Amino acid sequence: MAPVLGYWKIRGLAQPIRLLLEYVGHSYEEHSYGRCDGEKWQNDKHNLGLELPNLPYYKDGNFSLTQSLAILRYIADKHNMIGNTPVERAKISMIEGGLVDLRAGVSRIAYQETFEQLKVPYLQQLPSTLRMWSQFLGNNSYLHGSTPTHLDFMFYEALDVIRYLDPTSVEAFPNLMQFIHRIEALPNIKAFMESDRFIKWPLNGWSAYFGGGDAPP
């Protein structure tokens, strides 16, 4: 019946997609692959009709996609959240790119042993990165236009992951904190987050020294 979103049973790259789906209210099924389901994925991989096999994937009948940003932009596009002029469309793609980097910064250091060493320079850098994001947000409720878009769920997830790594870093910018609360207050987001479905943990792949494991440390 309903479209499928396949991903590891983790937050990671798919969580902004789930948040967007939930916020716009579109029906979907998740096909989760748990920590011990590596081989199940291997069996499905070349077998789902996908043109560029990967996780996450997204299947709706005949139509299928991979690449998390493409999936997210597909849903976004349905709600006219990707811009209407070359200038605006570009601006949105820049925002996405920066948000991809914001998230990936955490991922780049989370999978190696020396994470606690790497954390040190990371936090030296972070405040300017965050400052950049807080000036870009400014006094607006959302990153672009005046209602939530996929950029906002991207940004929320990144922030939330990063607050976890160091709660005070994000806490130093009032507008980012108020943003975090703004999104958590969105009724479909709140309901989702309070539901059976919601995946609080892990933030990254299970094998991560930070954001990994079956539960928080």
Ligand X SMILES: N[C@@H](CCC(=O)N[C@@H](CS)C(=O)NCC(=O)O)C(=O)O
The 91-130 contact track toward a copy of itself, x by CB under 8 A, reads x-xxxxxx--------------------------------
Decide if residue 132 touches a copy of itself (CB under 8 A). yes
Residue number, 87 or 215, with CB nearest to a copy of itself: 87
φ, ψ for residue 165 (rounded to 5)?
-65, -40
* Chain centroid offset of residue 180 CA: 13
- List residues bridging with 30 in a β-sheet: 5
| Gap between the Cα atoms of 140 and 155, Å rounded | 14
Check residue 55 for interaction with ligand X (CB under 6 A): yes
Phi-psi region of 23 (alpha: psi -120 to 50; beta: other; left: phi over 0): alpha
Q: Which two tokens stand for residue 3?
A: 């479209």
CB of 185 to ligand X, least distance (A): 28
CB 4 within 8 A of CB 28: yes
What part of residues 20-59 is at the interface with Zn ion (CB under 5 A)?
24
Tokens representing residue 114 in the block:
């020396």
Give me the least distance between CB of 75 and ligand X, in Å please: 14
Decide whether 69 or 170 has the Cβ nearer to a copy of itself: 69
Binding residues for a copy of itself, rule CB under 8 A, total 30
Cα 138–chain centre separation: 21
Q: Cβ neighbours of residue 135 under 8 Å, at least 6 residues apart?
A: none
- Alpha-carbon Rg for the chain, nearest whole angstrom, is 17
Q: 10 to 69, contacts with a copy of itself by CB under 8 A?
A: 51-54, 63, 65-69
Q: Does the footprint of ligand X cover residue 54 (CB under 6 A)?
A: yes
Locate 154 and state its tokens: 């991207």
Q: What would the x/- binding string for ligand X be over residues 34 to 53, using CB under 6 A? A: -----------x--------
Site residues, ligand X (CB under 6 A): 12-13, 45, 54-56, 67-69, 97, 101
Site residues, a copy of itself (CB under 8 A): 51-54, 63, 65-71, 73-74, 77-78, 82, 86-87, 89-91, 93-98, 132, 136
